[PDB]
Amino acid sequence: SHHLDWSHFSRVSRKQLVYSTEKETPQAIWRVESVGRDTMMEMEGEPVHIGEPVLLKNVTTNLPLIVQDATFLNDYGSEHELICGKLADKKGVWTFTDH
Amino acid sequence: VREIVHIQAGQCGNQIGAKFWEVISDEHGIDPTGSYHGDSDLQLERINVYYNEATGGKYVPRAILVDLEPGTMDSVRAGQFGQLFRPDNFVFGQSGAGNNWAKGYYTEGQELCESILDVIRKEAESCDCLQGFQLVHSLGGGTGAGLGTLLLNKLREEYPDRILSTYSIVPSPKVSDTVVEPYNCTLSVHQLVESADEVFCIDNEALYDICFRTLKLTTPTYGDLNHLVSMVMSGTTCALRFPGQLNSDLRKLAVNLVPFPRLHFFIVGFAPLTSRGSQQYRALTVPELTSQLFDNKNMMAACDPRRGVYLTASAHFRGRMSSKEVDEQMLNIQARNTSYFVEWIPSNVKSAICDIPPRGLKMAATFIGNTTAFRELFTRVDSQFQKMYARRAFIHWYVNEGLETVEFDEARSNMTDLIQEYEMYET
Amino acid sequence: VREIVHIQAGQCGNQIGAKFWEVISDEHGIDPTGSYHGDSDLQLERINVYYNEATGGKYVPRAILVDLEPGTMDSVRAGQFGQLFRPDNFVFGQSGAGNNWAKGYYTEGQELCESILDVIRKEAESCDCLQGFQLVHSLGGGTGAGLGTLLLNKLREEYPDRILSTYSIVPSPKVSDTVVEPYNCTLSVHQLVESADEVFCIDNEALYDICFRTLKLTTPTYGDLNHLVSMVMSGTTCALRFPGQLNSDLRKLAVNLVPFPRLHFFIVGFAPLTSRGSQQYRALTVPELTSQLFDNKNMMAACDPRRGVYLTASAHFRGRMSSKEVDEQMLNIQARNTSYFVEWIPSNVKSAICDIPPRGLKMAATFIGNTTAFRELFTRVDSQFQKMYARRAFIHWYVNEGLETVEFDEARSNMTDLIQEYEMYET
Amino acid sequence: RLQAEKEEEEAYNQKFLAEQKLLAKLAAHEQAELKQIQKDINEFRATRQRPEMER
Amino acid sequence: MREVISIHVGQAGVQIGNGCWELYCLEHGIQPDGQLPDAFNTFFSETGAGKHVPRAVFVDLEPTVVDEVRTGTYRQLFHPEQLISGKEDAANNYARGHYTVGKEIIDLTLDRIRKLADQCTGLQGFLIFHSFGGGTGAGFGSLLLERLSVDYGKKSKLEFTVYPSPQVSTAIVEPYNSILATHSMIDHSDCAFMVDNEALYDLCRRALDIERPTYTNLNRLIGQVVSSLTASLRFDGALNVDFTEFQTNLVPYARIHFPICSYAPVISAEKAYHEQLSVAEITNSLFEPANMMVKCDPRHGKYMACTLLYRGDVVPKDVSAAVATIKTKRTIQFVDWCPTGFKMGINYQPPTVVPGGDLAKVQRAVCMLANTTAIAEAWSRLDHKFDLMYAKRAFVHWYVGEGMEEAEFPEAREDLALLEKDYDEVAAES
Amino acid sequence: MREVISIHVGQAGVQIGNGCWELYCLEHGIQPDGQLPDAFNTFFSETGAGKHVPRAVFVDLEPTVVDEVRTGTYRQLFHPEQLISGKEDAANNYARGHYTVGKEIIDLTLDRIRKLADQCTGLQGFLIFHSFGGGTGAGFGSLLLERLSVDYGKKSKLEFTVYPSPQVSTAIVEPYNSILATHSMIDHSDCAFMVDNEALYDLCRRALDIERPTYTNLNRLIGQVVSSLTASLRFDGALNVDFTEFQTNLVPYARIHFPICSYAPVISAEKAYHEQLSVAEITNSLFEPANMMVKCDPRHGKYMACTLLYRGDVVPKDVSAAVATIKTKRTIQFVDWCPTGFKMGINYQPPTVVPGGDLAKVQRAVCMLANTTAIAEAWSRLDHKFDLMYAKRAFVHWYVGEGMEEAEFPEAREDLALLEKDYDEVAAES
């Protein structure tokens, strides 16, 4: 991700960018967290289960990853835009799946 | 080791400050929780100017946040950046702001004043050296205009030598967020003239105009509007924090641009600004930067310089660049438009160069100028103040707090003489 | 071999005393059964200062507990460390305290005075040498204030050379736990001024203020409040028990701090008290302790030093530390705030360094100061006393016991003169 | 010498932060305990001290 | 943190209470029993466990209206001592509800408001609801505000009252109580809002699509306006507006405080899908006379100050453009001695819908509160009606018998004339 | 250990007493037979290894009240000697209970109380209960204290008596008995607490939710105060208060001793579920006139020193903030020569609930004893009632016939009159 100057904005919503790269960058680091406004104290070191709901926060910006309901014609099809912004509702909750 | 202490007052100051601390924290490569996740050693050379170090690898800003109602402060806590600041530096009241200059200055400001000053004493006397303080506030409100000026007098009394740089937002002329603004703006300026060494004036209208003209943003929120302000605040202190070919800190800026103690209100402008899609096609060089800086449309304050004359101007350059190319532009821009500079001061353009640019940009430049075009800004508010003061009823909100009507006359007269002083050095 | 005899009077004395031995026993390494299970040889060096050894590896403190009703004594023994004390040092009456000074001094005190002195005699004359006694009592009550002072007269007559250090709790200004305190405290000062060598004044409200301000204890109990006082009593005698780079025992403290025989009332404070969350922001440096001790909020007595001038001051530092760093802080703190120190005494700050710190902390400090600000606390009780005296208030309870009305007039006159005496030396 | 002392200072700080974090955990536990005791009292009032049971 | 206390008087006040507190509970999400399946502490107190209680007092002098709450669904949420009910109503008599029966119960209420104030660390104001035409609403409400003026002093006492309709009337003695209550309000009230039933009926039928409403539908329209008014205290926003900011910016003079209210967009859930409803569109709708909740035409007079509150995906840039345009028109007149005239407040929480409601799931809305000289039109109608009835002394015997001295009738008449002079003097230009 | 002796006089004293000892045996954990299924020594004695006995003497001049205890379930707990019953009561006549019939039983009882004082090694005082209107309560109560004063001398004799109510009255000769006993009470008693049935009726109907109470419920509420008063001597606490401390702290002069009582929270079971009831809340409730156990408004007079006793979860930090706030309350007055004005105590052991009691179980509670000049209001009413009857001398013949000389009627009447200006002089300030 990156911190939303005029040269780094998402290409539909113009919110905080999430992008793909090959470069070793500090922004590439992702930290995981549990759902809830105080839950981290109780389960700071427990192992994450498959299918368990969690949040993905970018260390340098401490914000969760959110799918925004907007599409662009990526010639692979029609794929939803991803941003890293303020937590709301439950679109920002992610679950790992092994299959 | 030229430490600077930062103070944010009111709703306007906190939102500007909150965005401001993101910019430097990125520049030095500092995580929001306070840990250095950076990319180069040069970022740690002189980080002491703005951050204190807590044993554990955590960096704490030299910031004090001030408000009269706790609503604004909790937005900072709940925000992404709510852990970085020291808890004791949050000082807030339990009364309404009032949106009133007199009530903030005398009624609630006194109680918070002693509590505020000791927090500054902790920060001010914690460092080996101290160049100056830094305050951000708005003049149309009640807390920043009222309590902000009260703190500025006390700081002058205790630390006369230090540079009290302030960044101020002036009420807009066409459509404005508050009705009582002409009373708040007039009384605050009287305090600011005699107290602060340097004052930078910023208007919201230009920021709407600049974003809508140049950056091509359809819907500019306060997040991007404050981002333009934070670039100016970081650019001025860039000489302190990094090496360069030719250094120029605040006190060099004050010495050169201020010919007389009372004429020190400044306008600011920043380059390069280019549309988010047009940036690929732009051949950004040193001559290109100067075209944007001195262009009247990039001025962050709504005072067209062409209607007045320049007294002094300063330019700051950042990035690896030619010193010859920088020096030539200062000649050409001064010589090509000789109608816009005062004859009795030759070499009105100051210059400086810094080594390390902000992220994403290979080169950038910053402009600070002092001009008699400021007469436009104060004429608008005095006329509106005169128009309202003709019906003394609104003063009743200010009389019930203790302010006497003579203080309106004192403030307006002092503002009027400043305008006449600008007129007569134009010749 | 500078033995000290410890005496506790009343409800306040026993509960402060009971917590006091929990602190020392853990410091020296004594299991609550009384046996040594320590970790270092230095702990067994000078345990003779406070303890006697019963044959078998069991150590007994030199403690004598005094009360008029045995109610609080039995609450102590049920505690963890109650078994430690010698059973025959528990001296108590079988009659109510009455919260009355004259009742404690004349009616029940004389009966107990016969036996208590002989218990003092056994402990005073079982040691190779004796430096002084140690008294813990409160002044607002009738048992600690009344019977505590009576024993003070007998101790002075029998053992004039020895240092009679006393620790006192002063009635609070806002909410105070007894109606008749102005009578009790006024009479008690008459005995304290003429007989005691050193007196320390502790106010309960300041203990509450420190707990809520600094330690952020949501519900501070009397265990926590008595914990803070124990450190000061632990800190002062640490020079006797452990080696140091610059030793300073009780008699050095009195000679340096006391300029005149009647001005010996002192205020104390302890650093570092660390907030349960602020620690991760606090780096322990020798300057960091110095800011806390001289900070007015940290003072344990609710009389503001800024309102008066200092006569003498003393700072004790504990741990392995640089001797230059300590000596520099005394010079800087003295020169920076010269407005609060007397001209005709240069070098107003005394210093000392002791090698072994309290457990868990690698450095700690203790402060003792003498100032004219004590004029505040005497005027408060004098103002309250006169109003209850102008009309005959509760007086009839004291007169019935046998106390003459002329004793109050001697008490108030002597108390009044000590207010003037502080005023005179301010010039 | 400088290497040895600096490492000892760093070790002390990490121990102190660890102990501070422990006290914060127990402090949160205490308020959880108080809420449970409050719910126990509401149970006593709701089921055992009832207006149909007064003497 | 920052807190308000709500006081409700009379049948109109209590029925408004259900309308508003249903919205507060639903919008905050608390169940009617006080559990959960934040800003909570501005309106509700916690007692431990998970139980919340409203920070409000309901007052009336007859038990029928209150017992509907006591027996109703919401009965468990409210605390028994807050609901206060007298013995016999004021019978549409100001003197009865001010001297005889009012003073029988006034001191009991003053304990419950003050005791409720002990749980207030950061109290910043009160909210009080009246109906001018009623007996208790005017008689007891006047006696309540006079006492609260000295009990607490410089604390904002906002009011939200129902001005008499220009022609629609339910009580013949309506002009008597409205004028007498006005004298008590003006000196003691910090600011008092007016709405009228007749305008709401027209708005609830034209803009919102209902053939025939009841008082329940009207109460929900008021509930939305109050919710927007306090949203700045409760939720994050680019531009918050505290109570104190509201007081100073709107009132130009001590006695001129009276504003008028409007809300937009008000549109049926069916037709709401048909328009994008930009910031410019909804802003233009407020300024039309048809949307005004008080049936006085602003074009007859001038505007003194204005305040706009936005609740939705509303950006600061497009607010300024809309307010700039409405300034360019020459159908919205302003007194030229007030060049600025606006305060804008912005909040992020969108308006909340209610089951069985009449409004839609709108993503942006705007609320408007402005002071106008057009309200002098309303005062003239009431003054003329009172003059006809008092000239022949049509109802004086009822009021004098209940403790009131006759000298109050000309004093109230004279004081209203001074207020009419003030509004005309303000409208003067230099 | 440390001992207290309880003495009970008359129907009121006895049937209050068995209610109190019902609480105390329940609190310590002693079955009605005296066995078990500590602090016992303050109130009980151990006979051999298993059985306890109260330190109490029950006295009345008629057997109906005492024999109810003798046939009850608790009969095995008491020693047969402790229950002393006369032959025929005093018929609410002070002279009969003082001179003719009182002296028939005085010396028998004085041996029994003295014999119990031998078993009390560390005795510190007595508690004595009265009803002022009763013949034995006033007549024999005066004779008991006059003898007890010279028997023991310097021992703290505290009293707990029922002041006749302002309007509620069950005896016509009630004013006569109260004044005559008052003159004997004032010189001999160390301190005596005032309570009246009328205030207890209103409190136990308003706060406690009971439509139709009896003397049984009122006797419970008295027991709660006495239990908290003695809680310092029995159980641990952060600030202990002995009996002798109350004597010195409360009374400024010899004759001004009479304090009044208050207790909070008194709340129904299903309302305490609804309310928080912290330290500050219960302290505020103590000072309202409604919670006073004597129906005299303190706002008519001024406060001298007050004593507070807290029980349960209270922490010393919260106490100081609460009492400091009550000083800021300007509806509470203090005489100028009492700036300190307070005596506080904190105890850990919570109140003991009862099988089938009406009081809820709060984990924190507070008891108050306050000395005020408002009691002079009660003396004026009692004096006025006495003055009307004595002018025409409506009941003198009954008293004179039973051994009383008339000259005692005006002398006791003057002694009350001196006390009336005793309170007025104290009420003044300089």
Ligand SMILES: Nc1nc2c(ncn2[C@@H]2O[C@H](COP(=O)(O)OP(=O)(O)OP(=O)(O)O)[C@@H](O)[C@H]2O)c(=O)[nH]1
């Ligand atoms: N808008 C609105 N007005 C109401 C409502 N209920 C009552 N009113 C108004 O109240 C007026 C009559 O007064 P009341 O409702 O009785 O109020 P009150 O002050 O309690 O008068 P009393 O019952 O005599 O004590 C009517 O003319 C209505 O206009 C309501 O639910 N909504």
Ligand SMILES: Nc1nc2c(ncn2[C@@H]2O[C@H](COP(=O)(O)OP(=O)(O)OP(=O)(O)O)[C@@H](O)[C@H]2O)c(=O)[nH]1
């Ligand atoms: N609180 C309370 N008061 C009581 C109770 N019983 C009686 N009283 C009061 O006692 C007064 C009546 O006097 P008695 O109780 O008969 O006292 P007495 O000394 O036995 O009178 P004699 O018949 O002459 O022996 C009345 O004023 C009652 O209010 C009771 O159970 N509780």
Ligand SMILES: Nc1nc2c(ncn2[C@@H]2O[C@H](COP(=O)(O)OP(=O)(O)O)[C@@H](O)[C@H]2O)c(=O)[nH]1
């Ligand atoms: N540029 C900018 N202006 C702001 C911001 N927040 C508030 N303001 C301006 O501040 C002015 C009034 O601020 P106010 O709420 O009264 O703050 P106060 O000084 O504490 O009373 C308005 O004109 C706003 O336009 C911001 O984030 N950026």
Ligand SMILES: Nc1nc2c(ncn2[C@@H]2O[C@H](COP(=O)(O)OP(=O)(O)O)[C@@H](O)[C@H]2O)c(=O)[nH]1
């Ligand atoms: N710091 C502290 N003060 C106490 C404690 N217990 C009592 N006090 C204070 O001591 C003062 C007098 O206590 P008192 O009961 O008269 O002791 P006495 O001398 O035995 O009569 C009161 O004002 C209390 O506030 C305690 O445990 N710690």
Ligand SMILES: [Mg+2]
């Ligand atoms: Mg009504």
Ligand SMILES: [Mg+2]
């Ligand atoms: Mg009887």
